[PDB]
Amino acid sequence: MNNNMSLQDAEWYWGDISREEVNEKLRDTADGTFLVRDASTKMHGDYTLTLRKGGNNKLIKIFHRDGKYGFSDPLTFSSVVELINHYRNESLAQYNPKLDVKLLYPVSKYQQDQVVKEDNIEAVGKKLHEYNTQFQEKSREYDRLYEEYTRTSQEIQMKRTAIEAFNETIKIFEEQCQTQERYSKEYIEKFKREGNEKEIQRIMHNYDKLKSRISEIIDSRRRLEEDLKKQAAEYREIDKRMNSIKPDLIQLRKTRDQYLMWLTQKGVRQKKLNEWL
């Protein structure tokens, strides 16, 4: 039943697609996930098998000589479908004991059939146009949020060092309180006895202005702290919104792409696709 089916009809056969496309199909997939593509025209071999093993993509080339297929001489399989179907039922330890895994999970080119069976070329090429505009609308939504995100992160950074600069300043003006306090416990004592209230007056006026200045700078720093908290909250809030957009974005792109492949089979005029975009 299985082995008589043509390679061209086989689900895990994708023909001439690039290693890159293969890479996106295989990313973050479980062990035993696989598909077959045409080999690159510059190397020997007819097809490349790519499977998941231990977080990596394994490329195993399938050769042909005189009606026979295989990974190495001797070539002992009658067809590619046969070879694959063998290893879907037997561990690749047989070929390489270092590679203990079987070909468990195919990657169907009729997988788009699950998310779309909708048939009319133009019923699909219109849904595509709809999913696409839904996608670019969210794209811009997320981009605008990203420029707020960066602008806010920087202004927070500015504010933070300003807080540190306020603290150094307050530190100094309070060391100037010590400089003033210390330089007076005697030079005012001597006008206390003798009662030179004349001059004591305007030292107090000066000391007060020092206290007054300290007080206003502590206000400023205090006001900056409330602005810091305000903006930090704006930042975290921004980060939350982006995190709600992110999943919808990938799916929208994933869905749009699936519909792009389905329209790539059925070979839609690539100038039509452009008008649908």
Partner: protein, 994 residues
């Protein structure tokens, strides 16, 4: 701003002065007033105040205040203006100066160039940092000594290094432009006090040293040669070394451009005294457990995920969160990634030991933990990274990590959708107001170290203990070696390559392939690789650089790669690839490594390299992922670069003022007319303090170009909303008129110029490839330098016009060009136009830059066409769109074909168009054959943070356009196929009736 919250302070302002007798005295001031003036007027009014009894003379006191960077700064230079003080708030303290005054003045100068106070390094707990700070000095010291190994000639070679090509050989079509292998060359000299210039037209051999040129001038031959040295007229570029004359870049392009070299004679002694002899001072900062070996621990690797403080997630929109995890060697996992359980977003707590399929002794030296907290939203669901973080499993002293640690995570870069970021930097986010993940590693009753090389060789012999290289094989090795750095090798190929690892030495350039065939998660195979790497033949620098990307993290491999650079990398090519070499520093696990040592040494023994070394590092200082690393590196450089730090500080100061000004234009005047913005600008630039900053400094675009007086009347804002500044300086060289009288540079503040900086580097390398093969396809890689976060400089190209400027019917362009060249010079211009067109046509297709239009494309008077405004490349608008196709950015309309066909109406069918077609065909294949270099260059940039260069998938675009999976014959047909499609059949194929 020039005071916190304020862009520019008013003409007058009050200053709280804090006297050492505890008084506080206000003082009316002027924004350009100097400290000396301030102090004088301050102590004046101090006598109005109580207790001036205890106030000494001003001479006994100094000024101190707080800066924008929250540092307590001491102002020794009392001529410095109040608006250049960078005060946080407008107050000054006057105190008794104490401590090494020299170190403090240098420290504040370094900190100014560095964009951050050196004192912030002092209070870093982390030992790797303080170890770097001390150890790196050994290289700095080593550097200044190489700079005196043969003084005073060593001194001048540092400051004015010979700007030469790599090889003195001339390509055939360059030699063919000389007269019987000789070149016409003009020399000038100072006459008297009136110092007028006078010609001494020489005609000598190209291969001549400056000695001969110095000799012939006077028309005692071996008598007076070493009395003088040659200088380029217009530049501060010199000829100090015994290179063949034609090997200097300037001479070479004169020959190339059909320009006549104009040199200036100068007294050797006259320059040698202008050299500072700048010295270098050493800065102030100059368990009995019996440690276990890594290979002694019979245990499987496990790590515990405890809890995260918080994530920023709308509790309405996301179902669960979990921690994704991976043990990585470079970009490849060593085993399967392991997730934690899924838990609610409201309580990020796990407390579960994750187990990995790796036996601890099999952990390679460069192994890393890559993690992220991921959100999850029929059975289908979506997975998204919330924040990420990477950890070296071994620290810089080879110690395996152990016990509890906290990891403050990073924001996910824009556009990244991978659940993990193994290419990101390692270590914790310095910002602590951020998601913090707690984890616990096993602790092994001891301190665990990775084995020394001795023990590794020990195990290597043991592993192996417990044959004619056939012709069949010998060709397969060749074949495999010809794959490009991103052509994955098969499992059969891995097994084969490994089996013949010993024979692979015969064919050394296959090292990257062999290293990819090593089971990196097996100490057996890694140990054997180490031995091979130890005695491996050196390889060309272009190939060594492949081994410096994020796919070869192992220090032995990197070590060999760096060692190849020490021997075989010329300063010329070092300058060419500097962008990537600096970028690659982000891939290094540790602050201290061979590459940073090699780079710093080169930067400190060559001022031209040091110049751009500084700027590439500085431009990324805002980026907190490399802040510390680059900041530390920069401190080292600035400490040991000698006098140039002062030159660099004038550049930094000039740019910061251009930054303040454009800031004001963009936010405080967003809704004012261009006409009133210009007048504002003019009034600001007119101010003394600005004219001091913006005049008399070295161009960061080219340090050989001095920027003199601003021609302010001719400076302009431009049309874009970023308000770019069109700036115009006088070239103050006394021989100015012989090169250029004025220097025009566009200052842009608001757009990322790194893409353009990269694109223009690539274009230069392409033109270089073509030249070395007899394809004179002249390109225009004008200067472009990123100097900060979306801040940069662009060189203006003189005597150029957009295509539209011509147009504003398909015959006009040819007509314009005709008038500008009418006569016997018409065919050297349809020519130049055609070559130019071929190069840019091929270059833009390969790179996939933004769609060309009539403002995108420019032409010089003499026919040379070029492109500007690249911005996007590798077809980055592939994200919005969904097509797989490869665009042709630069389509030749009839307008261009007509110019190519010298007027002919059948422009798609002519000896000219078909001749043009073969130029492109040759240029294309030429680049395709150097694909490795370009793929490698792009690969080194993946950490840069450029949105267009995040994954290897992004680099895959030029594998496509260069059709590297295809055959050379198919690649040409593919190219033709792409042209014919874009030119709508009108690109004549090899299907033509002759």
């Amino acid at each position: 701003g020039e005071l916190w919250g304020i862009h520019l302070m008013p003409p007058r302002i009050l200053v709280e002065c804090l006297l050492p007798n505890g008084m506080i005295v206000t003082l009316e001031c002027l924004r350009e007033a100097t400290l000396i003036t301030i102090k004088h007027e301050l102590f004046k009014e101090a006598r109005k105040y109580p207790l001036h009894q205890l106030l000494q003379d001003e001479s006994s006191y100094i000024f101190v205040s707080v800066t924008q960077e929250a540092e307590r700064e001491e102002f020794f230079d009392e001529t410095r203006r109040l608006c250049d003080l960078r005060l946080f708030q407008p107050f000054l303290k006057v105190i008794e100066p104490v401590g090494n005054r020299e170190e403090k003045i240098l420290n504040r100068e370094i900190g100014f160039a560095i964009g951050m106070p050196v004192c912030e390094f002092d209070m870093v707990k982390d030992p790797e940092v303080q170890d770097f700070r001390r150890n790196i000095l050994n290289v700095c010291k080593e550097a200044v000594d190489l700079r005196d190994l043969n003084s005073p000639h060593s001194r001048a070679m540092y400051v004015y290094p010979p700007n030469v090509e790599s090889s003195p050989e001339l390509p055939k079509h360059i030699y063919n432009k000389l007269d019987k292998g000789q070149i016409i060359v003009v020399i000038w000299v100072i006459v008297s006090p009136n110092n007028d210039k006078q010609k001494y037209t020489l005609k000598i051999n190209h291969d001549c040293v400056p000695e001969q040129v110095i000799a012939e001038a006077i028309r005692c031959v071996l008598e007076y040669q070493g009395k003088y040295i040659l200088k380029v007229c217009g530049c501060d570029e010199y000829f100090l070394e015994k290179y063949p004359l034609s090997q200097y870049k300037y001479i070479r392009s004169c020959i190339m451009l059909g320009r006549m070299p104009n040199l200036m004679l100068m007294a050797k002694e006259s320059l040698y005294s202008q050299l500072p002899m700048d010295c270098f001072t050493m800065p102030s900062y100059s368990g009995e457990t019996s440690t276990k070996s890594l290979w002694v621990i019979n245990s499987a690797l496990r790590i515990k995920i405890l809890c995260a403080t918080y994530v920023n997630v709308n509790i309405r929109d996301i179902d669960k969160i979990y921690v994704r995890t991976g043990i990585y060697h470079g970009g490849e996992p060593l085993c399967d990634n392991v997730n934690t359980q899924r838990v609610p977003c409201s309580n990020p707590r796990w407390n579960e030991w994750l187990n990995y399929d790796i036996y601890i002794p099999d952990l390679p030296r460069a192994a890393r933990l890559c993690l992220s907290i991921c959100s999850v939203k029929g059975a289908k669901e979506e997975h998204c990274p919330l924040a990420w973080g990477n950890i070296n499993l071994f620290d810089y002293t080879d110690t395996l990590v152990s016990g509890k640690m906290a990891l403050n995570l990073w924001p996910v870069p824009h556009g990244l959708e991978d659940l993990l970021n193994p290419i990101g930097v390692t270590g914790s986010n310095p910002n602590k107001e951020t998601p913090c993940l707690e984890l616990e590693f096993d602790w092994f009753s001891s301190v665990v170290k990775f084995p020394d090389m001795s023990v590794i060789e020990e195990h290597a012999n043991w592993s192996v203990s417990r044959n004619e290289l056939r012709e069949n094989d010998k060709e397969q090795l060749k074949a495999i070696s010809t794959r490009d750095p991103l052509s994955e090798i098969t499992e059969q190929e891995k097994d084969f390559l490994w089996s013949h690892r010993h024979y692979c030495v015969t064919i050394p350039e296959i090292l990257p392939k062999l290293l990819l065939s090593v089971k990196w998660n097996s100490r057996d195979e890694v140990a054997q690789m180490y031995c091979l790497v130890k005695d491996w033949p050196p390889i060309k620098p272009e190939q060594a650089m492949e081994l410096l990307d994020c796919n070869y993290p192992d220090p032995m491999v990197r070590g060999f790669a760096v060692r190849c650079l020490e021997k075989y990398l010329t300063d010329d090519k070092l300058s060419q690839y500097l962008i990537q070499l600096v970028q690659v520093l982000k891939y290094e696990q540790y602050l201290d490594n061979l590459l940073v040592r090699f780079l710093l040494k080169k930067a400190l023994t060559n001022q031209r390299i040091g110049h751009f070394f500084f700027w590439h590092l500085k431009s990324e200082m805002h980026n907190k992922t490399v802040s510390q690393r680059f900041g530390l590196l920069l401190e080292s450089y600035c400490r040991a670069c000698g006098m140039y730090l002062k030159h660099l500080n004038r550049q930094v100061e000039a740019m910061e003022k251009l930054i303040n000004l454009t800031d004001i234009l963009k936010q405080e005047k967003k809704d004012e007319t261009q006409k009133v913005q210009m007048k504002f600008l003019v009034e600001q630039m007119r101010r003394p303090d600005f004219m001091d900053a913006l005049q008399g400094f070295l161009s960061p675009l080219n340090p050989a170009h001095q920027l003199g007086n601003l021609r302010l009347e001719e400076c302009r804002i431009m049309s874009s909303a970023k308000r770019p500044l069109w700036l115009n300086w006088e070239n103050p060289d006394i021989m100015s008129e012989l090169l250029f009288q004025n220097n025009e540079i566009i200052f842009k503040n608001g757009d990322d110029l790194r893409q353009d900086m990269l694109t223009l580097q690539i274009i230069r390398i392409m033109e270089n490839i073509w030249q070395n093969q007899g394809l004179d396809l002249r390109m225009l890689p004008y200067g472009c330098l990123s100097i900060g976060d979306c801040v940069g400089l662009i060189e203006v190209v003189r005597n150029s016009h957009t295509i539209m400027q011509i147009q504003c019917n398909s015959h006009t362009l040819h007509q314009w060009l005709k008038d500008k060249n009418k006569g016997e010079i018409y065919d050297a211009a349809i020519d130049l136009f055609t070559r130019s067109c071929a190069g840019y046509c091929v270059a833009t297709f390969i790179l996939g830059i933004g769609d060309r239009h009539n403002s995108n494309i420019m032409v010089k008077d003499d026919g040379q066409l070029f492109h500007i405004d690249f911005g996007h490349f590798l077809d980055h608008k592939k994200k919005k769109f969904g097509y797989k196709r490869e665009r042709v950015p630069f389509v030749l309309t009839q307008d261009f074909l007509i110019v190519i066909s010298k007027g002919a109406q059948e422009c798609t069918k002519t000896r000219e168009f078909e001749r043009f077609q073969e130029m492109c065909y040759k240029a294309y294949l030429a680049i395709r054959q150097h694909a490795n270099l370009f793929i490698n260059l792009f690969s080194m940039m993946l950490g840069s943070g450029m949105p267009e260069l995040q994954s290897f998938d992004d680099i895959a675009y030029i594998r496509k356009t260069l059709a590297l999976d295809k055959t050379e014959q198919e690649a040409l047909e593919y190219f033709m196929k792409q042209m014919n499609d874009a030119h709508h059949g009108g690109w004549t194929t090899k299907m033509d009736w002759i």
